Enzyme design. Structure first.
Site, PDB file in Angstrom:
ATOM      1  N   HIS A  69      22.225  -4.897  -1.183  1.00 50.30           N
ATOM      2  CA  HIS A  69      22.488  -6.197  -1.805  1.00 50.30           C
ATOM      3  C   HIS A  69      22.335  -5.982  -3.325  1.00 50.30           C
ATOM      4  CE1 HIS A  69      22.237 -10.554  -2.549  1.00 50.30           C
ATOM      5  NE2 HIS A  69      22.315 -10.803  -1.248  1.00 50.30           N
TER       6      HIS A  69
ATOM      7  N   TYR B 220      21.203   5.083  12.294  1.00 47.04           N
ATOM      8  CA  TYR B 220      21.672   5.061  13.695  1.00 47.04           C
ATOM      9  C   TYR B 220      20.514   4.655  14.617  1.00 47.04           C
ATOM     10  CZ  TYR B 220      25.202   7.631  11.215  1.00 47.04           C
ATOM     11  OH  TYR B 220      26.140   7.950  10.286  1.00 47.04           O
TER      12      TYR B 220
ATOM     13  N   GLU C 124       6.915  -3.603  14.087  1.00 45.56           N
ATOM     14  CA  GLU C 124       7.036  -4.041  12.716  1.00 45.56           C
ATOM     15  C   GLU C 124       5.960  -3.400  11.851  1.00 45.56           C
ATOM     16  OE1 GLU C 124       4.887  -5.847  10.662  1.00 45.56           O
ATOM     17  OE2 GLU C 124       6.284  -6.517   9.085  1.00 45.56           O
TER      18      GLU C 124
ATOM     19  N   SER D 269      10.245  -8.020   0.507  1.00 47.20           N
ATOM     20  CA  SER D 269      10.385  -7.268   1.753  1.00 47.20           C
ATOM     21  C   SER D 269       9.014  -7.044   2.361  1.00 47.20           C
ATOM     22  CB  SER D 269      11.175  -5.990   1.530  1.00 47.20           C
ATOM     23  OG  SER D 269      11.301  -5.277   2.742  1.00 47.20           O
TER      24      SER D 269
ATOM     25  N   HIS E 186       7.878 -10.475  14.675  1.00 45.59           N
ATOM     26  CA  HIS E 186       7.307  -9.368  15.453  1.00 45.59           C
ATOM     27  C   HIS E 186       6.167  -9.815  16.404  1.00 45.59           C
ATOM     28  CE1 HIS E 186       3.570  -7.985  13.055  1.00 45.59           C
ATOM     29  NE2 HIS E 186       4.137  -8.704  12.104  1.00 45.59           N
TER      30      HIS E 186
ATOM     31  N   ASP F  24       7.186 -14.457  11.197  1.00 42.23           N
ATOM     32  CA  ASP F  24       5.870 -13.824  11.254  1.00 42.23           C
ATOM     33  C   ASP F  24       4.791 -14.900  10.990  1.00 42.23           C
ATOM     34  OD1 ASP F  24       3.978 -11.884  11.528  1.00 42.23           O
ATOM     35  OD2 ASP F  24       4.533 -10.702   9.803  1.00 42.23           O
TER      36      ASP F  24
ATOM     37  N   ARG G 139      12.460 -17.590   5.192  1.00 39.28           N
ATOM     38  CA  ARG G 139      11.178 -17.584   5.892  1.00 39.28           C
ATOM     39  C   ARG G 139      10.345 -18.772   5.343  1.00 39.28           C
ATOM     40  NH1 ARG G 139       7.903 -12.369   3.318  1.00 39.28           N
ATOM     41  NH2 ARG G 139       6.890 -12.616   5.412  1.00 39.28           N
TER      42      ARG G 139
ATOM     43  N   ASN H 158       0.468   0.696   7.529  1.00 42.40           N
ATOM     44  CA  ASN H 158       1.231   1.921   7.295  1.00 42.40           C
ATOM     45  C   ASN H 158       1.388   2.118   5.783  1.00 42.40           C
ATOM     46  OD1 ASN H 158       4.215   1.667   6.257  1.00 42.40           O
ATOM     47  ND2 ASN H 158       4.088  -0.059   7.689  1.00 42.40           N
TER      48      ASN H 158
ATOM     49  N   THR I  59      15.665   8.746  12.314  1.00 35.58           N
ATOM     50  CA  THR I  59      17.088   8.428  12.660  1.00 35.58           C
ATOM     51  C   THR I  59      17.727   7.444  11.679  1.00 35.58           C
ATOM     52  OG1 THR I  59      16.297   6.599  14.085  1.00 35.58           O
ATOM     53  CG2 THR I  59      16.667   8.712  15.196  1.00 35.58           C
TER      54      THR I  59
ATOM     55  N   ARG J 120       0.807  -1.225   0.000  1.00 35.53           N
ATOM     56  CA  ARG J 120       0.000   0.000   0.000  1.00 35.53           C
ATOM     57  C   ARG J 120       0.843   1.280   0.000  1.00 35.53           C
ATOM     58  NH1 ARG J 120       0.403  -1.803   4.988  1.00 35.53           N
ATOM     59  NH2 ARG J 120      -1.136  -3.531   4.901  1.00 35.53           N
TER      60      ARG J 120
HETATM   61  O1  LIG Z   1       6.276  -1.602   6.656  1.00 34.40           O
HETATM   62  C1  LIG Z   1       6.552  -2.658   6.024  1.00 34.40           C
HETATM   63  O2  LIG Z   1       7.551  -2.792   5.271  1.00 34.40           O
HETATM   64  C2  LIG Z   1       5.602  -3.880   6.167  1.00 34.40           C
HETATM   65  C3  LIG Z   1       4.713  -3.761   7.457  1.00 34.40           C
HETATM   66  C4  LIG Z   1       3.570  -4.873   7.391  1.00 34.40           C
HETATM   67  N1  LIG Z   1       4.139  -6.248   7.301  1.00 34.40           N
HETATM   68  P1  LIG Z   1       3.165  -7.513   7.742  1.00 34.40           P
HETATM   69  O3  LIG Z   1       1.663  -7.029   7.624  1.00 34.40           O
HETATM   70  O4  LIG Z   1       3.407  -8.167   9.133  1.00 34.40           O
HETATM   71  O5  LIG Z   1       3.351  -8.608   6.589  1.00 34.40           O
HETATM   72  C5  LIG Z   1       3.304  -8.258   5.208  1.00 34.40           C
HETATM   73  C6  LIG Z   1       3.140  -9.552   4.397  1.00 34.40           C
HETATM   74  N2  LIG Z   1       1.771 -10.144   4.475  1.00 34.40           N
HETATM   75  C7  LIG Z   1       0.727  -9.876   3.653  1.00 34.40           C
HETATM   76  O6  LIG Z   1      -0.385 -10.456   3.701  1.00 34.40           O
HETATM   77  C8  LIG Z   1       0.872  -8.655   2.759  1.00 34.40           C
HETATM   78  C9  LIG Z   1      -0.546  -8.200   2.369  1.00 34.40           C
HETATM   79  C10 LIG Z   1      -1.208  -8.950   1.186  1.00 34.40           C
HETATM   80  N3  LIG Z   1      -0.275  -9.061   0.031  1.00 34.40           N
HETATM   81  C11 LIG Z   1       0.592 -10.069  -0.148  1.00 34.40           C
HETATM   82  O7  LIG Z   1       0.684 -11.058   0.615  1.00 34.40           O
HETATM   83  C12 LIG Z   1       1.584  -9.956  -1.343  1.00 34.40           C
HETATM   84  C13 LIG Z   1       2.768 -10.671  -1.155  1.00 34.40           C
HETATM   85  C14 LIG Z   1       3.732 -10.690  -2.148  1.00 34.40           C
HETATM   86  C15 LIG Z   1       3.541  -9.965  -3.319  1.00 34.40           C
HETATM   87  F1  LIG Z   1       4.547 -10.012  -4.211  1.00 34.40           F
HETATM   88  C16 LIG Z   1       2.365  -9.207  -3.523  1.00 34.40           C
HETATM   89  C17 LIG Z   1       1.360  -9.218  -2.527  1.00 34.40           C
HETATM   90  C18 LIG Z   1      -2.347  -8.015   0.771  1.00 34.40           C
HETATM   91  O8  LIG Z   1      -1.982  -7.060   0.063  1.00 34.40           O
HETATM   92  O9  LIG Z   1      -3.506  -8.204   1.219  1.00 34.40           O
HETATM   93  C19 LIG Z   1       4.016 -10.661   5.030  1.00 34.40           C
HETATM   94  O10 LIG Z   1       3.422 -11.597   5.607  1.00 34.40           O
HETATM   95  O11 LIG Z   1       5.242 -10.528   4.927  1.00 34.40           O
HETATM   96  C20 LIG Z   1       2.607  -4.521   6.220  1.00 34.40           C
HETATM   97  O12 LIG Z   1       2.754  -5.082   5.080  1.00 34.40           O
HETATM   98  O13 LIG Z   1       1.790  -3.563   6.482  1.00 34.40           O
HETATM   99 CA   LIG Z   2      17.377   4.572  13.163  1.00 34.53          CA
HETATM  100 CL   LIG Z   3       7.461 -14.915   7.853  1.00 38.21          CL
HETATM  101 ZN   LIG Z   4       3.322  -9.286  10.472  1.00 38.12          ZN
HETATM  102 ZN   LIG Z   5       0.753  -6.975   9.318  1.00 36.04          ZN
END
Ligand SMILES: O=C(O)CC[C@H](NP(=O)(O)OC[C@H](NC(=O)CC[C@H](NC(=O)c1ccc(F)cc1)C(=O)O)C(=O)O)C(=O)O
Ligand SMILES: [Ca+2]
Ligand SMILES: [Cl-]
Ligand SMILES: [Zn+2]
Ligand SMILES: [Zn+2]
Ligand SMILES: *[C@@H]1O[C@H](CO)[C@@H](O[C@@H]2O[C@H](CO)[C@@H](O[C@@H]3O[C@H](CO)[C@@H](O)[C@H](O[C@H]4O[C@H](CO)[C@@H](O)[C@H](O)[C@@H]4O)[C@@H]3O)[C@H](O)[C@H]2NC(C)=O)[C@H](O)[C@H]1NC(C)=O
Ligand SMILES: *[C@@H]1O[C@H](CO)[C@@H](O[C@@H]2O[C@H](CO)[C@@H](O[C@@H]3O[C@H](CO)[C@@H](O)[C@H](O[C@H]4O[C@H](CO)[C@@H](O)[C@H](O)[C@@H]4O)[C@@H]3O)[C@H](O)[C@H]2NC(C)=O)[C@H](O)[C@H]1NC(C)=O
Ligand SMILES: O=C(O)CC[C@H](NP(=O)(O)OC[C@H](NC(=O)CC[C@H](NC(=O)c1ccc(F)cc1)C(=O)O)C(=O)O)C(=O)O
Ligand SMILES: *[C@@H]1O[C@H](CO)[C@@H](O[C@@H]2O[C@H](CO)[C@@H](O)[C@H](O)[C@H]2NC(C)=O)[C@H](O)[C@H]1NC(C)=O
Ligand SMILES: *[C@@H]1O[C@H](CO)[C@@H](O[C@@H]2O[C@H](CO)[C@@H](O)[C@H](O)[C@H]2NC(C)=O)[C@H](O)[C@H]1NC(C)=O
Ligand SMILES: *[C@@H]1O[C@H](CO)[C@@H](O[C@@H]2O[C@H](CO)[C@@H](O)[C@H](O)[C@H]2NC(C)=O)[C@H](O)[C@H]1NC(C)=O
Ligand SMILES: *[C@@H]1O[C@H](CO)[C@@H](O[C@@H]2O[C@H](CO)[C@@H](O)[C@H](O)[C@H]2NC(C)=O)[C@H](O)[C@H]1NC(C)=O
Ligand SMILES: *[C@@H]1O[C@H](CO)[C@@H](O[C@@H]2O[C@H](CO)[C@@H](O)[C@H](O)[C@H]2NC(C)=O)[C@H](O)[C@H]1NC(C)=O
Ligand SMILES: *[C@@H]1O[C@H](CO)[C@@H](O[C@@H]2O[C@H](CO)[C@@H](O)[C@H](O)[C@H]2NC(C)=O)[C@H](O)[C@H]1NC(C)=O
Ligand SMILES: *[C@@H]1O[C@H](CO)[C@@H](O)[C@H](O)[C@H]1NC(C)=O
Ligand SMILES: *[C@@H]1O[C@H](CO)[C@@H](O)[C@H](O)[C@H]1NC(C)=O
Ligand SMILES: *[C@@H]1O[C@H](CO)[C@@H](O)[C@H](O)[C@H]1NC(C)=O
Ligand SMILES: *[C@@H]1O[C@H](CO)[C@@H](O)[C@H](O)[C@H]1NC(C)=O
Ligand SMILES: *[C@@H]1O[C@H](CO)[C@@H](O)[C@H](O)[C@H]1NC(C)=O
Ligand SMILES: *[C@@H]1O[C@H](CO)[C@@H](O)[C@H](O)[C@H]1NC(C)=O
Ligand SMILES: [Ca+2]
Ligand SMILES: [Cl-]
Ligand SMILES: [Zn+2]
Ligand SMILES: [Zn+2]
Lengths: 692, 692
Positions: free
Chosen positions: B631, B218, B370, B463, B323, B399, B480, B203, B215, B156
């Site tokens: 990377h 750091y 997170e 990511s 997280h 996660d 993962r 977010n 920050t 998003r």
């Molecule tokens: O701030 C950040 O970098 C991420 C914070 C946060 N991470 P989090 O919610 O715990 O996990 C994100 C992600 N999980 C998801 O379900 C992402 C949302 C879901 N999309 C996907 O799974 C998605 C995954 C891979 C891709 F190439 C395209 C879409 C959706 O849009 O409804 C995961 O399990 O790694 C978020 O995505 O709001």
């Molecule tokens: Ca910092």
């Molecule tokens: Cl994970």
């Molecule tokens: Zn999560």
């Molecule tokens: Zn989440």
């Protein structure tokens, strides 16, 4: 036995003499065929000496050369356009060299082309404070003027940067007898002084650690993508040319305008040292004209890299490196250093041929194109940065072994202080009147530490030599040592970068017995030996704790010249002092553990903590606008590449802060730098904590 | 015996169930008192479980919260200024939770405040290609319009960046049933679908790996100097707010202007999906008004860090981290993961209490904040970057353990492919119809690799989760694993980030027996076990050689869509293919040596070469304008933070290159990136050569 004493005893003054003679009969300018031939010779001999492998590592880098058929010179032109005086086209060659080919004429490497004409302004040493004095105090405007500055005090690249930022349209550099002619000594060939026709060559880049101007970050290999000239790093934007003091006098004698502000602005020529701009009454219509036609060209350079594989820890590298390229003959700079490296390789090889190997790998380097901006060492370190980052124990530099015959000079990381003290107590002093005394004794007597009774002075590393990439970019513990002059009685060496810096200069005037060279070989070779062979790395982290406190006190005292702003903007050094206190406590505990443990994994753990401690001072974001200066404790002075500055991030934030237009922003940046320094010191301390 | 089987057998589905229940009874929003209490509980229990040390590491970071007394909402306002329809102030709470306090209402974290009024434009998923289609093909101008986009496809934050660069003055995000309502399944509480009143929090930052916006570089510790808000990293400059599909329908049903360009732009609501701008005939004078009053505030967060010290190599760290903070109850995200970590710690502790220790240190992490931008893991890695750089063997993320109940999903470095294959062949499949078969078998059958017969699909890391600092900034081998859905039959999970994502959701609909959780615990825990205990690190460098070739072929095929420009600008991939060939040859030789050597220094040398191989892909200058993505082989897609991109430097240089105004400059930058990639691959290969 195969021990350090066997290594040290095999070094011979007579061999260093023979090698120096061998290396200085013809010029070895970077990028030339003669310097490639010398590279091939060094490679062949290092193999004969017994090294496991010896390779050439070549790069295609930006170099700079005069145009052979369109010589550089400076004129005084009269109102009509007639050139009524011309500076020399070459230095009169010394006795017996009057028929040597390929002596490059004096020039400033990387000057752009141009023919600017204008009025002269004399800017003393062209230091930051000299321009402050001209602009702020004397209200003299350098814009569109040709600046003339005397060499000395600071790196010539900083002079040119300063002139360029003051709006100059050209720079003339000269050697004043006040700085390059010691009283009561004769000019070359009858003494070691600079003659009036003598001229100091040298580059005028402001690379800030970048290496080849065209490929910052990456080695200049065969498929490298190169910046265009206009995006190159560090190139000056105005023409620059160096002259000797006979020629300087002809340019200075006519200067009018304002008197020199004080005696510190007067050299030793019989001229008023008027600041200008322009000439007095009669000659007010005459101008100075430069004619610069030098070209920058991408040219191949060759480092020689020799390996002596470690018996126990072959994946740990102790590096002995120094350059091979010279401006002309390189009698001192660099061949007095390269001859010493050569004898050191020969000695290590004798021990290897009897079945010995050091515990850790030793790498030996003959760097090319150092004189053009540390290009060979930097490109090779950029190519090998991952191996160096993870395996580099230490780098010992090995440029000029002598700049005087008075006492030892050592600049190094605090991590090597104890090693240097211990080693010099085991070496014999070569000094007259100290027969049977240790080098430590004669050095301490001649060069006492300013804060510690019965210790010698050891300085922080600056830059302007090949350790720069290893220390300030990569964070590998680095050191250098050479014989030097007595600073009290005479305020480098006069013949530096001139055609007169020859084998005979060294053999007749500096070191006829080659005993100072031999002493330097023992110090540099002994340091390498201990670094490469001691079971526990010979670094004492507690010595870093002591200097960190000195540097913190120093930077805090600078800030305390502005107590009102510190109150207003809430500027506290508390976090830095706290980090330094923590580093002191943690280092002390780590030293106890290091005393108190044949478990080889435990040994390797603690050696890795020693090895990575220098590395911990690196900030991967670099210093402000200098991404290749990454060490947070030490950087080359932004005003003088030769000098090291401590807590450079904070120092530069405080520098001339009372002149900044936005004090709030300027003091915010001081605070930001205090936070970065405190955090980095604390992070380095924590690398010495128990690992789990 | 204390072996992996003893560890795996101690893991219990019943314990994971109990922990999940325990972690999901109340919200655990980052920065709140409830989440600090949960941190203290986890710390206490990890100590009881037997870890050597368990500490809280706290940071003060920028978070974002709605204003409790000034709720966020969206209106349709008529010509007079009367708000004739308002979106919901909260999601109707699920059965039995209607009295739970402190459920944060739906909002977009880090939206600025504002009340923009305007005409709507519907931008599909708000992808780069959706804006291309609007602007270039349909000639629809988003400037000063309020954009409405459906969630899905990409992160998003990228949607909001794209809208912001198209000139939007606000963004409304909604969940379309086409993306969040699986056909033939009921809405929560009667099935696992999103109800019409359900809303996805999350977010909308564009941090590019920076961590705390204030920050970058750091840790946000007690004395940190903070950027002002206006210089903060990643904050959106227009208001944004998320809504459910009942509310979206009221906003979409009136849209006029242009028809959707094709069926891929139509969701499942009974509306035309007209792109706008604005409403049809009758309602052309009505506007959409946002009311956003959320505030950003520096708030304390708490990571829990548990240590299990290694018996042999305590200075080598294998990290299991995930997280703990959630948007509301975190039934899946993250507590289905944290409950698994909890059971893994408990199991390792049982073995420790019987006198076992792993060979290497294992670190266990419960990360905070997170959901607000990977803030807790990133700040802790910034604080400890030197220890992690030099000692970090691997990072396993932990996660959400489930997003479906169909088969395994693994994303990881190629260095872990062989480990994952071997481990899954030793684990039992939990799947119906694969009783008595290995997980490898059921996974391979359900999710075949697209290029290799009889292997399962393993994806590259993207990511949007806590491995980002460890993998793309620091270059620590990362992986993962989780259970996932069948992608063929249904194109995340519907209740993601909604109040309805509860314990009951998991227990009733996803994993009533907790067998998928147990399988995931075995995969994640088994990987940690092997990484921390195998004498030779379980990485196969040859697997990197194979994918590097795939990625090189892929990037070359992208460039080859422009053969004329490749001819004109002399664009060659020869150096990259050469580097990849060299990597393949060197890796093959290194594997032979690894087979062919109880000499513990030789063992530690070769483990260090394995460990530093991921590290060798790091470029300390970072990718263009993304200094924290270092990377060179993998970065998050610049168009979608969730997806990984290979050779991202070259990919981004080629992207939409046919639209660049200066083709010469654009193709020069493609060539520069090819050089950086070729050099980095060759440099990494050389870390596997004999060390001397
Ligand atoms: O701030 C950040 O970098 C991420 C914070 C946060 N991470 P989090 O919610 O715990 O996990 C994100 C992600 N999980 C998801 O379900 C992402 C949302 C879901 N999309 C996907 O799974 C998605 C995954 C891979 C891709 F190439 C395209 C879409 C959706 O849009 O409804 C995961 O399990 O790694 C978020 O995505 O709001
Ligand atoms: Ca910092
Ligand atoms: Cl994970
Ligand atoms: Zn999560
Ligand atoms: Zn989440
Ligand atoms: C040098 O080493 C010492 C360790 O011996 C290390 O000491 C640490 O100092 C920090 C920062 O000052 C302490 O941080 C505190 O931690 C407690 C929790 O343990 C908090 O409650 C405190 O926060 C409150 O108080 C603050 C100060 O007024 C308020 O601003 C804040 O809003 C809270 O109300 C505070 O964060 C930390 O506990 C110690 N650690 C110890 C003693 O073990 C020191 O930081 C090191 N120096 C450097 C430069 O790193
Ligand atoms: C993959 O590994 C191989 C090693 O097996 C490595 O091969 C190297 O390729 C380089 C770059 O192409 C070779 O460079 C040459 O070196 C010789 C000296 O040994 C020079 O004389 C050559 O320069 C001349 O020819 C050039 C090419 O036309 C001219 O442009 C130039 O002006 C000179 O006239 C040239 O520099 C190098 O010798 C080999 N090393 C070997 C075979 O050991 C290859 O580079 C690796 N791939 C990558 C991407 O690193
Ligand atoms: O490009 C670069 O960074 C340096 C290239 C080159 N390095 P190199 O000539 O081999 O050695 C520089 C230096 N030697 C010198 O004599 C420098 C010149 C001498 N000045 C000094 O020794 C000096 C040294 C320290 C200091 F803080 C101020 C002045 C002078 O100005 O006449 C050294 O021995 O490290 C150069 O300085 O032109
Ligand atoms: C410096 O020393 C080297 C090595 O002794 C000399 O180069 C050798 O010259 C010999 C005999 O004259 C040749 O047969 C060899 O091929 C050379 N050996 C090499 C390159 O390793 C060199 O001539 C000396 N140079 C000067 C100026 O004295
Ligand atoms: C300084 O050098 C210049 C250039 O060689 C001399 O001026 C040139 O003299 C020749 C022959 O007299 C003329 O044909 C050229 O046109 C002149 N060139 C320029 C650029 O003026 C000049 O005479 C020399 N001055 C002194 C005092 O030796
Ligand atoms: C320099 O020499 C001193 C004096 O020998 C060394 O310090 C001693 O080291 C031994 C061996 O571990 C200790 O048992 C003594 O207590 C130390 N004496 C002291 C501190 O006065 C010192 O380690 C050497 N520095 C090196 C090798 O870097
Ligand atoms: C989750 O589990 C923990 C640990 O069992 C519960 O916290 C404990 O509650 C007990 C007994 O009720 C107290 O005496 C302890 O002080 C707590 N232990 C801790 C914090 O380690 C907690 O109540 C449970 N939470 C829920 C919502 O079920
Ligand atoms: C949507 O919500 C707004 C704000 O609560 C409602 O408009 C307010 O109504 C009160 C009482 O009628 C007035 O005193 C305020 O001045 C209004 N505020 C604004 C900003 O207009 C509105 O009625 C609601 N609309 C619907 C359909 O429920
Ligand atoms: C995964 O398992 C395979 C099959 O056992 C391992 O490959 C074998 O490793 C042994 C032990 O060194 C060799 O002697 C065999 O020749 C290998 N068999 C092959 C390549 O088919 C492989 O090492 C394991 N991967 C890990 C542990 O990362
Ligand atoms: C050197 O100067 C000559 C003679 O005037 C000129 O023809 C040539 O281009 C120059 N060489 C260069 C610029 O390399
Ligand atoms: C110096 O003089 C020039 C006029 O040529 C002018 O442009 C410039 O502003 C002056 N600079 C200062 C600092 O006085
Ligand atoms: C060598 O030492 C002597 C004795 O102090 C001194 O007078 C002479 O100047 C020195 N030579 C050089 C080049 O410094
Ligand atoms: C929340 O909104 C209220 C009520 O209108 C206001 O007084 C207060 O400042 C706001 N709180 C914030 C901005 O933290
Ligand atoms: C869109 O419209 C606005 C007028 O408000 C104008 O400023 C802008 O240039 C337009 N942009 C495009 C891409 O057509
Ligand atoms: C669980 O598995 C069954 C059997 O395939 C499936 O019909 C159901 O949709 C799955 N539940 C979830 C939440 O995916
Ligand atoms: Ca370079
Ligand atoms: Cl030196
Ligand atoms: Zn020099
Ligand atoms: Zn030199």
């Amino acid at each position: 036995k195969h021990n350090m004493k066997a290594f040290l005893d095999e070094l011979k003054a007579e061999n260093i003499k023979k090698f120096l003679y061998n290396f200085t009969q013809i010029p070895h300018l970077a990028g030339t065929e003669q310097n490639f031939q010398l590279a091939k010779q060094i490679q062949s001999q290092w193999k004969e000496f017994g090294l496991d492998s010896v390779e050439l590592a070549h790069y295609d880098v930006l170099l700079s050369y005069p145009n052979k058929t369109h010589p550089n010179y400076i004129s005084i032109i009269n109102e009509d356009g007639n050139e009524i005086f011309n500076t020399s086209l070459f230095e009169p060659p010394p006795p017996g060299y009057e028929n040597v080919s390929d002596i490059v004429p004096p020039f400033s490497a990387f000057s752009p082309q141009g023919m600017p004409e204008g009025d002269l302004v004399y800017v003393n040493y062209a230091r930051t404070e000299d321009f402050f004095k001209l602009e702020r105090d004397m209200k003299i405007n350098c814009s569109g003027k040709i600046v003339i500055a005397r060499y000395g005090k600071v790196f010539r690249g900083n002079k040119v940067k300063n002139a360029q930022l003051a709006g100059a349209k050209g720079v003339i550099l000269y050697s004043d007898p006040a700085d390059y002619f010691a009283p009561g000594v004769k000019s070359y060939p009858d003494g070691w002084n600079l003659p009036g026709g003598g001229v100091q060559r040298g580059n005028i880049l402001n690379l800030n650690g970048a290496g080849d101007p065209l490929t910052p970050g990456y080695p200049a290999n065969e498929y490298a993508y190169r910046r265009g000239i206009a995006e190159a790093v560090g190139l000056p934007s105005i023409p620059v040319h160096p002259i000797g003091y006979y020629d300087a006098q002809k340019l200075l004698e006519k200067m009018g305008g304002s008197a020199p502000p004080d005696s510190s602005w007067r050299g030793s020529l019989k001229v008023p040292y008027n600041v200008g701009p322009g000439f007095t009454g009669n000659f007010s219509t005459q101008k100075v004209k430069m004619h610069i036609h030098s070209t920058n060209e991408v040219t191949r350079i060759y480092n020689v890299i020799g390996t002596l594989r470690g018996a126990v820890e072959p994946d740990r590298y102790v590096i002995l490196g120094g350059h091979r390229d010279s401006w002309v003959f390189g009698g001192i700079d660099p061949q007095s250093g390269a001859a010493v490296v050569h004898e050191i390789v020969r000695s290590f090889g004798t021990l290897k041929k009897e079945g010995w190997r050091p515990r850790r790998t030793i790498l030996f380097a003959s760097w090319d194109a150092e004189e053009f901006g540390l290009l060979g060492s930097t490109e090779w370190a950029e190519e090998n940065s991952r191996l160096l980052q993870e395996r580099g124990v230490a780098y010992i530099n090995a440029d000029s072994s002598i700049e005087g015959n008075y006492t030892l000079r050592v600049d190094c990381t605090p991590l090597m202080y104890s090693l240097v003290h211990n080693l010099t107590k085991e070496l014999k002093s070569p000094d007259e009147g100290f027969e049977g005394k240790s080098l430590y004794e004669s050095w301490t007597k001649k060069s006492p530490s300013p804060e510690f009774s019965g210790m010698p002075r050891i300085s922080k590393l600056g830059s302007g030599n090949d350790f720069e990439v290893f220390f300030q970019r990569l964070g590998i513990a680095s050191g250098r040592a050479r014989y030097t002059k007595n600073w009290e009685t005479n305020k480098g060496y006069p013949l530096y970068h001139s055609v007169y810096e020859t084998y005979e200069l060294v053999e007749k005037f500096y070191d006829p017995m080659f005993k100072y060279h031999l002493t330097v070989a023992q110090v540099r070779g002994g340091m390498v030996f201990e670094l490469a062979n001691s079971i526990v790395l010979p670094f004492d982290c507690r010595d870093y704790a002591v200097v960190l406190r000195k540097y913190a006190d120093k930077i805090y005292s600078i800030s305390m010249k502005h107590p009102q702003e510190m109150k207003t903007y809430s500027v506290s050094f508390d976090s830095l002092f706290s980090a330094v206190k923590n580093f002191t406590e943690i280092a002390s505990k780590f030293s106890e553990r290091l005393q108190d443990f044949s478990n080889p994994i435990v040994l390797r753990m603690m050696n890795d903590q020693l090895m990575f401690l220098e590395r911990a001072f690196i900030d991967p974001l670099g210093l402000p606008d200098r991404p290749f200066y990454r060490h947070v404790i030490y950087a080359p002075s932004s005003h003088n590449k030769y000098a090291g500055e401590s807590f450079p991030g904070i120092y530069d934030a405080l520098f001339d802060i009372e002149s900044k237009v936005d004090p709030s922003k300027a003091w915010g940046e001081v605070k930001r730098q205090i936070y970065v320094a405190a955090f980095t010191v604390q992070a380095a301390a924590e690398t010495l904590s128990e690992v789990a």
